[PDB]
């Protein structure tokens, strides 16, 4: 990874058009330079407190992004083996220290090969043509459309280093 790295919880909707950390830092630099009645009766349905807590806590999944946006991993909560694991940390003396495990998260990479959008995808799925061209992604890559966060950030950063 390209340090520094951040591991936060955030909305994953449109995780192809979100500003990279490097871009935000650059934008901060230029900003600094520039400035220089209800129904009164309703029924609530009993819900187990634990599931609601889990639902609320896991509403925004973990997102692991490096500085340049080169790596963007989204974590998903796994419940099959969440509470049966135990951690043994090997201290720097040969000994072992035991720590109970809380949760297991499965992380999958995002935006490494210039994915499409839902509207663009649906237009292709419908009968725009008999079948999508085999090398459509290569074709659209050269037109300039459908780039990645990594490239979208690098060209902007180079657009500043050039001046």
């Amino acid at each position: 990874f390209h340090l520094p790295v951040r591991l936060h919880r955030k909305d994953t909707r449109n995780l192809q058009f979100q500003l990279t950390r490097a871009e935000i830092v650059q934008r901060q630099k230029e900003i600094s330079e520039y400035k220089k009645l209800r129904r009164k009766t309703r029924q609530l349905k009993v819900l187990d407190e634990n599931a609601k807590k889990l639902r609320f806590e896991e509403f925004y999944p973990w997102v692991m992004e490096d500085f340049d946006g080169y790596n963007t991993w989204v974590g998903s909560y796994e419940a099959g083996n969440s509470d049966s694991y135990v951690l043994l940390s090997v201290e720097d003396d040969g000994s072992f220290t035991m720590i109970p495990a809380d949760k297991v998260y499965k992380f999958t990479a995002r935006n490494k090969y210039a994915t499409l959008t839902i509207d663009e995808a649906e237009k292709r799925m419908d009968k725009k043509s008999g079948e999508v061209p085999r090398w459509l992604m290569k074709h659209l890559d050269n037109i300039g459309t459908t780039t990645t966060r990594y490239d979208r950030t690098r060209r902007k950063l180079k657009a500043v280093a050039d001046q």
Binding site: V5, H8, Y85, V86, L87, V90, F96, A101
Partner: peptide, 18 residues
Amino acid sequence: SLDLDLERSNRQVWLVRL
């Protein structure tokens, strides 16, 4: 600091099912 701390990552750990 809001950055992930990659300092203790070089620490051997055993995943043990009990």
